[PDB]
């Protein structure tokens, strides 16, 4: 019943770097589990290669390991810490996969580690698709007609049997990874080869189509006494055929009769019982034929998931925390319900009095050639959530919270466009990321609810609500601001219309609608989340806005409050890193005595965990929403510097409206963010910046260009133009102009200014040269090649910039070093994404420190005045989503595409880099054949790389001019033909597995376009590849290290710091 006694220490496996399909939700879950276990008295050990997580913060656990999530590495941790048990259900597919390998490898046996939460067998039963299917049949649940395949031949025969289109689902994958929908054979082979390959068990399940049926999911929790509860139900908005992760979804279910719901609830339970999950949570997914209620079991996830995080946020029932406790022996009835002030137990089914909506965040604009249609394989990079008393209020709020610039149903096509209905039709029929907008456009263009349904399969119950919102909008447009009487506006507000959407329709400024509401005293009220539809009281201040009567905010008059603004959904370049800082602001300030108020709506995060702060407002981070909160909270100060771009952009507006913004001023922010304003301060400071120019006209550039000197960084999506012709060519296709600093080292420096002094947090040398976005660059702390001398120049400049721009809290500075000269690239007057890594690396929690500075405690008062240089090296490496978008050229450049990062800790740089590289899922080997194909600039240094590879045992292949260069130096690689040259060529060789390493560098649009085949193959074929010579050298160095050799804990790391 109560806590297990034969277990003292638990190893928790983390999820690794954030990638599409496996994101922040695992930092939230992992953190909750550390939390619960530590509270319960267990000794906690955990491994997670991603430094940007709260779960890896040293005070969160007993032995924290920021090391590559490899079995051999984990093997060393077990050996070293000797955990009695392992909890592998809080780290995504990464953890499940690892647990099972450890098991397979016999490591568990080896050290007598007991698997808790979920057994190995149970996990496999759910994870192996064939096993899963047999089990459903065993319990009389129905599944789609299908066939298992382990090879292409078997695969064809299944298709031959189910017909097109068919759904391909690999075993041992999640988030639609390695799968898809085949409309034809061609696509069938493509998807099929992909998943057999990606499937850890080389297995695919091929099913007949159920595209268009309704999609549902249930979150279940089961304890050892067999007690079983439904924590939340979710109805998808997008139908079957579009992955749940890439679908808009809402809770609770809406269109099922109680009769139908009971059957699904009963089937959900039966499924857990059958698979054998006896001590945790699981997600069961189903398909429902809207025509006759026919129920089909689609799958089950024996662990915490992105839906379970959403469900916790939605209901206030902390699934991961509960599950952790169950894993060690507790039963639901023994645990107390968190938010009901521990008054009721955890053994109950939550009841909510509101509607929860989740909308996915996409970033197709960063992936040009990518197929931007929605399918069974996730493509989204994040998600936002909204709570409203109604579905319309919920939806709209979510729409404005998505950070895509929408104010709600903003139009996509013009009323007067002759082709709009055709475009509308296409977007509906074949869902893209923009579908929702197009739906409203459809209603404005004349299609009926029925016509829309027909194209989309989205339930009419939703469609009608959106239609109703459109008609209301048409009314606003007609009546205008004059017709915005108190009754109507209130109506509008109740349906979730935003002041900004109303303002566009009425042709006035947002502020005008805002005043109007003030005049009429029309403000939202706040309701609290409480798991039980007000049946019991609550003491947690977990809130959402709504246009209702009674307000439950009940703010303190007692305390000095500090508000922290979140970043909204995660997207490329605005990830978990911003959230870590928000969380830290909150933890430090609360610890210090302030009443902390968090404002954010990312359901995946720790910032939105009601434990993180005193008060949580789960709202869109917009000017409207914020002012409403500030209105009633009257805080001492507001932090806008930690949430990324989102809150950064509200700064001035917030100050204009009288909000007490703390830390670096909105003006200051602007000075740094405005290029022009920035260029003058640099000048003022007498610093060095590359030559630049603002060109309007083409012919105005071409000249100015001559002025600046090529190459040039065309920045309206950046570009590096090499020549005059290049320039034109650009514009054509296509304004600032900056001289591109060719072959320079890029560096980032994070720091803190308190008006009195500057504290250097860290100097990070990037591996990839300037021109490769810093977010996509691997980097090292401390610098691995920069002279202390030039580093001193940077520290000075950082200092001068800090004081000049009046920074108060964090800042980030980016330089480019060329010919022993420091050039300023930019100043980011807020927390940068490098903050968590620098903090982990140096043991100083810079976001807590900088937050104290913001609230008024100086560096000196806090005792943080000296730069810390660690005794070991920390290397950061990133993970790119290219494998999710095959049509894209997996090439680095000036624009950021990575989703996450990992950290490598070593005695030497080679050692850190090797850990970083392994942690990043690199397929690099220590032997084999390497293919070298480099650009002219690279021709010189390539020789040295080639010998290092030779010295290591590799054989070499080279294309034409590279072979020439190598030849002349004495290296004679095996010559290989380019695709044009003849056969066999690179493609063939790569396809055949001839290589284990590929080094391919290029320069010039055209040159890049041709060589596309190499990277594309390399990625497709899983061969490790570098696209920069600097990276190649870094890879060469790591060949000398052994990532599995030694492991170190964060506590130990930090203890080595003198």
């Amino acid at each position: 019943m109560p806590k297990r006694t034969d277990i003292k220490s638990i190893l928790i496996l983390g999820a690794g770097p954030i990638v599409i399909g496996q994101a922040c939700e695992f930092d939230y879950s992992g953190a909750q589990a550390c939390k619960a276990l530590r509270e319960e008295g267990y000794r906690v050990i955990n491994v997670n290669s991603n430094p940007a997580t709260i779960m890896t913060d040293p005070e969160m656990a007993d032995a924290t390991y920021i090391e590559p999530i490899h079995w051999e590495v984990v093997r060393k941790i077990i050996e070293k810490e000797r955990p009695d048990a392992v909890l592998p259900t809080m780290g995504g597919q990464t953890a499940l996969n690892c647990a099972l390998e450890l098991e397979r490898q016999g490591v568990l046996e080896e050290f007598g580690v007991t698997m808790i939460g979920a057994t190995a067998d149970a996990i496999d039963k759910a994870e192996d698709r064939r096993r899963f299917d047999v089990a459903m049949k065993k319990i009389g649940l129905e599944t789609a007609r299908s066939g298992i395949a382990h090879t292409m031949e078997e695969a064809l025969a299944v298709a031959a049997d189910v017909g097109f289109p068919c759904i391909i689902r690999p075993s041992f994958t999640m988030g639609g990874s390695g799968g898809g929908i085949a409309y034809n054979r061609e696509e069938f082979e493509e998807i099929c080869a992909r998943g057999l390959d990606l499937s850890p068990t080389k297995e695919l399940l091929i099913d007949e189509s159920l595209i268009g049926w309704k999609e549902y999911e249930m979150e279940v929790v089961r304890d050892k006494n067999d007690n079983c509860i439904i924590v939340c139900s979710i109805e998808n908005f997008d139908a079957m055929g579009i992955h749940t992760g890439d679908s808009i979804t809402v809770a609770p279910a809406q269109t099922l009769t109680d009769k139908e719901y009971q059957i699904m609830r009963n089937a959900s339970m039966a499924v857990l019982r059958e698979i054998g999950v006896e001590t945790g949570g699981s997600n069961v997914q189903f398909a429902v034929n809207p025509k006759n209620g026919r129920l089909i079991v689609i799958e089950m996830n024996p662990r915490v998931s992105r839906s379970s995080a959403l469900a916790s946020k939605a209901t206030g029932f902390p699934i991961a925390k509960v599950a952790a406790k169950l894993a060690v022996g507790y039963t639901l009835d023994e645990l107390m319900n968190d938010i009901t002030g521990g008054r009721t137990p955890a053994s109950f089914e939550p009841s909510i009095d509101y509607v929860v909506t989740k909308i996915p965040r996409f970033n197709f604009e960063k992936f040009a050639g990518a197929n931007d249609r929605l399918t069974t394989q996730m493509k989204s990079v994040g998600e936002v959530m909204a709570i409203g008393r109604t579905q319309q209020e919920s939806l709209q709020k979510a729409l404005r919270g998505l950070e895509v610039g929408a104010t709600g149903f903003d139009p996509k096509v013009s009323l007067d466009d002759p082709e709009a209905l055709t475009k509308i039709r296409r977007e509906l029929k074949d869902a893209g990321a923009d579908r929702i907008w197009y739906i409203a456009d459809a209603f404005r263009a004349g299609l009926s609810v029925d016509g829309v349904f027909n194209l989309t399969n989205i339930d009419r119950w939703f469609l009608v609500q959106i239609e109703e919102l459109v008609r209301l909008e048409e009314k606003v447009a007609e009546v205008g601001i004059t017709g915005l009487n108190a009754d109507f506006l209130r109506q509008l507000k109740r349906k979730g219309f935003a002041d900004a959407r109303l303002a566009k329709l009425a042709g006035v400024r947002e502020a005008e609608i805002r005043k109007l509401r003030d005049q009429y005293d029309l403000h939202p009220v706040y309701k609290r989340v409480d798991t039980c539809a007000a049946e019991f009281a609550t003491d947690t201040a977990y809130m959402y806005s709504t246009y209702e009567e009674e307000c439950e905010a009940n703010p303190s008059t007692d305390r000095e409050k500090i508000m922290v603004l979140g970043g909204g959904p995660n997207r490329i370049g605005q990830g978990i890193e911003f959230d870590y800082c928000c969380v830290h602001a909150s933890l430090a300030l609360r610890e210090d005595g302030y009443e902390t108020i968090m404002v954010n709506c990312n359901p995946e995060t720790v910032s939105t965990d009601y434990d993180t702060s005193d008060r949580l407002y789960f709202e869109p981070v917009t000017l409207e929403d914020v002012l409403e909160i500030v209105r009633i909270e009257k805080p001492k100060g507001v932090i806008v510097q930690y949430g990324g771009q989102t809150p950064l952009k509200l700064a001035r507006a917030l100050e204009a409206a009288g909000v007490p913004v703390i830390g670096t001023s909105p003006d200051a922010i602007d000075r740094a963010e405005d290029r022009e304003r920035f260029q003058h301060a640099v000048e003022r400071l007498k610093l060095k910046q590359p030559a630049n120019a603002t060109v309007t006209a083409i012919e105005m550039a071409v000249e100015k260009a001559k002025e600046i000197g090529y190459p040039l960084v065309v920045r309206a999506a950046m570009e590096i133009v090499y020549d005059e012709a290049d320039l034109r060519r650009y514009f054509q296709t296509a304004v600032l102009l900056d001289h591109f600093l060719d072959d320079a080292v890029e560096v980032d420096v994070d720091a803190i200014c308190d008006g009195e002094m500057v504290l250097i947090g860290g100097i990070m040398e990037h591996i990839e040269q300037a021109g490769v976005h810093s977010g996509d660059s691997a980097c090292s702390l401390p610098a691995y090649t920069l002279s202390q001398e030039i580093q001193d120049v940077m520290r000075q400049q950082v200092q001068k910039l800090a004081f000049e721009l009046q920074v108060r809290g964090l800042m980030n500075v980016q330089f480019a070093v060329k010919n022993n000269e420091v050039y300023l690239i930019e100043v980011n007057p807020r927390a940068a994404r490098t903050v968590p890594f620098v903090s982990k690396a140096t043991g100083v929690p810079l976001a807590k420190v900088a937050a104290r500075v913001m609230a008024g405690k100086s560096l000196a008062e806090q005792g943080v005045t000296k730069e810390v240089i660690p005794p070991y090296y920390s290397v950061k490496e990133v993970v790119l989503p290219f494998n999710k978008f095959p049509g894209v050229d997996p090439l680095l450049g000036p624009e950021m595409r990575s989703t996450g990062e990992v950290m490598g800790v070593g005695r030497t740089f080679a050692e850190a880099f090797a850990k970083a590289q392994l942690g990043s899922n690199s397929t690099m080997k220590k032997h084999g054949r390497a293919l070298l194909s480099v650009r002219e600039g690279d021709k010189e240094r390539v020789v040295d790389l080639a010998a290092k590879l030779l010295k290591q045992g590799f054989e070499l292949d080279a294309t034409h001019g590279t072979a020439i260069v190598l030849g002349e130096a004495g290296i004679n690689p095996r010559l290989v033909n380019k695709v044009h040259e003849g056969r066999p060529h690179i493609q063939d060789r790569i396809k055949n597995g001839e290589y284990t390493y590929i080094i391919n560098t290029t320069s010039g649009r055209r040159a890049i376009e041709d060589s596309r085949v190499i990277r594309r193959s390399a990625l497709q074929y899983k061969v490790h590849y570098d696209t920069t010579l600097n990276g190649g050298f870094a890879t060469a160095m790591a060949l000398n290290a052994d990532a599995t050799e030694k492991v170190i804990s964060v506590q130990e790391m930090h203890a080595q710091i003198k």
């Binding site: 006494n225 269109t255 059957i263 009963n266 009835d333 008393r389 009608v464 009674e550």
Partner: protein, 379 residues
């Protein structure tokens, strides 16, 4: 603009919109937390003279259908919701909810802050209220009617919704596939249970049938003698509206059955009566239990079941005579949920094992009954 308004005994007003019949409704206002099953709730006799507030905001999403009816009519005095959807959207739907309410002549209001309402009821306890839906709703009038309501405490409503004459029931449960099945032939049912109609849900009846019973529903007021005269294999005490305390007839009859060896099983009102007939005492809860997510533990098995609840009165554990042993309790508040006669084959459950709407978790209570039944037959 079809106005409506609800007023509680305390003076609180909620102005919204009329969504059912024109008129007024008076009763005790209660809240129900069920996210699905509004139709079933509406048609449960137990809701007699009560004004039902549903906390789940969208009520009506799936429309209505005959199979979802718990009785021949809508018993709820009135309906209080936050939002009526534009459309009903479900393959089983036969009529939109507004139409349905109108058709049943029900006074209903939408667009009010149901949360505020639930919070008041929770905090200050149950209150009587009144809804007026019409041209220009009289707030003073509504308050007066609310205040003039007698109240459910001491009110016998069982006699009021009971059948007039006894009847036979032999119809089992619905299936997705076959819907409601045809009534069975008496010879196909091994057992014969006599059911006391105190405002019985059809689902109770159907679940008994599913377990081998053939029944004879009898009016609330049936005598023990006439009852025993039927030679039943068991006796069933249905659920039903109002205060159980006043039903002196039932109590007496019951006491009468307890002298014999016939298995007796009560559900809800049936649970309270058994308790009363055994020397226990009933109380009116602060707000009671209405929802479908209520945890009740089988203490003899140390196990939890999520159940459907719909009761405003309860049995005091503290006054339990010695012959009554406690079998289940609420995990939300510890109230008494089940009892069993130590000396007789008589037991009851406060919650609704038949659900409709709700979790199927407590179905098994029915099996114990059969068990008892068969045992009595062995004799």
């Amino acid at each position: 603009i079809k106005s409506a308004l609800l007023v509680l005994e305390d003076g609180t007003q909620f102005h919204g919109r009329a969504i059912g019949a024109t008129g007024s409704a008076v009763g005790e206002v209660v809240f129900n937390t069920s996210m699905t099953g509004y139709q079933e709730i509406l048609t449960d006799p137990s809701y007699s003279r009560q004004i039902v507030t549903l906390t789940y905001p969208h009520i009506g999403n799936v429309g209505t259908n005959d199979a979802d009816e718990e009785s021949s009519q809508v018993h709820a005095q009135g309906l209080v919701i936050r939002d009526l959807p534009l459309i009903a959207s479900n393959f089983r739907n036969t009529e939109d909810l507004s139409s349905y309410l109108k058709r049943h002549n029900i006074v209903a209001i939408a667009d009010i802050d149901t949360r505020k309402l639930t919070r008041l009821l929770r905090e200050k306890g149950a209150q009587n209220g009144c809804i007026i839906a019409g041209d220009n709703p009289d707030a003073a009038l509504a308050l007066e009617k609310a205040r003039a309501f007698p109240g459910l405490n001491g009110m016998d409503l069982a006699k009021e919704v009971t059948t007039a004459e006894a009847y036979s029931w032999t119809q089992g449960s619905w299936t997705l596939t076959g819907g409601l099945p045809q009534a069975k032939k008496e010879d196909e049912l091994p057992f014969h249970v006599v059911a006391y109609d105190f405002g019985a849900k059809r689902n109770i009846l159907r679940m008994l049938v599913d377990r081998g019973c053939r029944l004879t529903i009898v009016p609330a007021q049936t005598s023990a003698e006439d009852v025993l005269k039927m030679n039943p294999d068991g006796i069933f005490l249905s659920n039903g509206p109002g205060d159980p305390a006043p039903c002196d007839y039932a109590i007496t009859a019951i006491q009468k059955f307890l002298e014999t060896d016939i298995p007796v099983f009560g559900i809800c009102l049936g649970h309270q009566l058994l308790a009363l007939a055994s020397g226990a005492k009933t109380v009116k809860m602060k707000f009671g239990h209405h929802g479908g997510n209520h945890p009740v533990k089988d203490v003899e098995k140390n196990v939890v079941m999520i159940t459907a609840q719909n009761h405003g009165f309860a049995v005091d554990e503290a006054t339990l005579p010695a012959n009554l042993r406690v079998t289940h309790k609420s995990l939300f508040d510890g109230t008494l949920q089940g009892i069993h006669r130590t000396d007789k084959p008589a037991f009851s459950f406060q919650g609704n094992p038949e659900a409709s709407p709700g979790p199927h978790d407590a179905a098994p209570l029915f099996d114990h009954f059969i068990e008892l039944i068969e045992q009595y037959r062995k004799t």
